[PDB]
Amino acid sequence: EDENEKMFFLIDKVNAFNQDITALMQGEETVGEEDIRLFTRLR
């Protein structure tokens, strides 16, 4: 099915964004080459 095919692309993307949010809340997020994580700058 082409309906199934179409479901894979959109449905997969939306979750991945949310998972990174979880990292952001815990001072674990992936950060740029010489940036500092949000949690440390607050301290």
Partner: protein, 330 residues
């Protein structure tokens, strides 16, 4: 396999054109080599099926001729150095090619490293590259310098090392048979003889008292395809404009007496050499085709699942894949 390959190769180029990619099969070239006066031009033109190679007295191949064959509807020829020139008479074509060689070297033992460039269009040919090369020697003749051997030798070596070069190995009787220019080059590139046929020409002129007997019996150094001999046009023959069919007739006479070849008589002649060479050529073409096919599959997929609205790809790619498939199945 040669018969089915020919049309498919032209079709494949057309599909490529549509993609707007510079993608070619790069058909392997075939080069004819041999001592001075060997009959080199005779051998080559017999394969092509036409009289177009200059032949003469003394030194015959006096300049290399790099001919590229081009599939086209009309039958004619054109020189790189003669922009725009129209013949239409193939006997005239032969004459013109010959004339250009005389232009630089004369007919007094010659030599020049500068290639003559010729495009021969025909609708029944492969886009191939064939090369007529100056005859290598061991001793100077006429006004050639003492180091004639070294100038000529280098020149032809640049063509025959090219991977997949069917070697028309012609070997002159007026040089020692074990010192064969043809057999040396042929053995260097393709030792097992899948596409090398050792050919000893001009057998009727060999000096009394010499022979290569063990080698020529296919025992000394056994080759799968062995050796096939031929007797090509003699000096009288070239002088007269003796035509193609005629030359083959002289061959028969010699072979019945020579001790080293009578037991292998049924595996002799020009015609038998023809059959073998064609088979190897086909292999190269096919090998390159899988790689392209795969690339095309990958490109299409991406846009389709996200349908990018760049639907133009879909149609272009589909076309290419069909052509590729048919060649792959044979």
């Amino acid at each position: 396999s040669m018969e089915d390959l020919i049309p498919l190769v032209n079709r494949l180029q057309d599909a490529f054109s549509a993609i707007g990619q510079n993608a070619d099969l790069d058909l392997p070239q075939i080069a004819v080599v041999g001592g001075q006066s060997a009959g080199k031009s005779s051998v080559l033109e017999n394969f092509v099926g036409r009289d177009f190679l200059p032949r003469g007295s003394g030194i015959v191949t006096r300049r290399p001729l790099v001919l590229q064959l081009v599939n086209a509807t009309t039958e004619y020829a054109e020189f790189l150095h003669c922009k725009g020139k129209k013949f239409t008479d193939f006997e005239e074509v032969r004459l013109e090619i010959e004339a250009e060689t005389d232009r630089v070297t004369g007919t007094n033992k010659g030599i020049s490293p500068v290639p003559i460039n010729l495009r021969v269009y025909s609708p029944h040919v492969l886009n191939l590259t064939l090369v007529d090369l100056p005859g290598m020697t061991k001793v100077p003749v006429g006004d050639q310098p003492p180091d004639i051997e070294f100038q000529i030798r280098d020149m032809l070596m640049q063509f025959v090392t090219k991977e997949n070069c069917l070697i028309l190995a012609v070997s002159p009787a007026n040089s020692d048979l074990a010192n064969s220019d043809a057999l040396k080059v042929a053995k260097e590139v393709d030792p097992q003889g899948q596409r090398t046929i050792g050919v000893i020409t001009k057998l009727d002129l060999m000096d009394e008292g010499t022979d290569a007997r063990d080698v020529l019996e296919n025992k000394l150094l056994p080759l799968r395809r062995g050796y096939i001999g031929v007797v090509n046009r003699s000096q009288k023959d070239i002088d007269g404009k003796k035509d193609i069919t005629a030359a083959l007739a002289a061959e028969r006479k010699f072979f019945l007496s020579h001790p080293s070849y009578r037991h292998l008589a049924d595996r002799m002649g020009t015609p038998y050499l023809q059959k073998v060479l064609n088979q190897q050529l086909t292999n190269h073409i096919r090998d390159t085709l899988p790689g392209l096919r795969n690339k095309l599959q990958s490109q299409l997929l991406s846009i389709e699942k996200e349908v990018d609205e760049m639907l133009r790809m879909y149609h272009a790619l589909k076309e290419a894949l069909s052509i590729i498939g048919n060649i792959n199945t044979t």
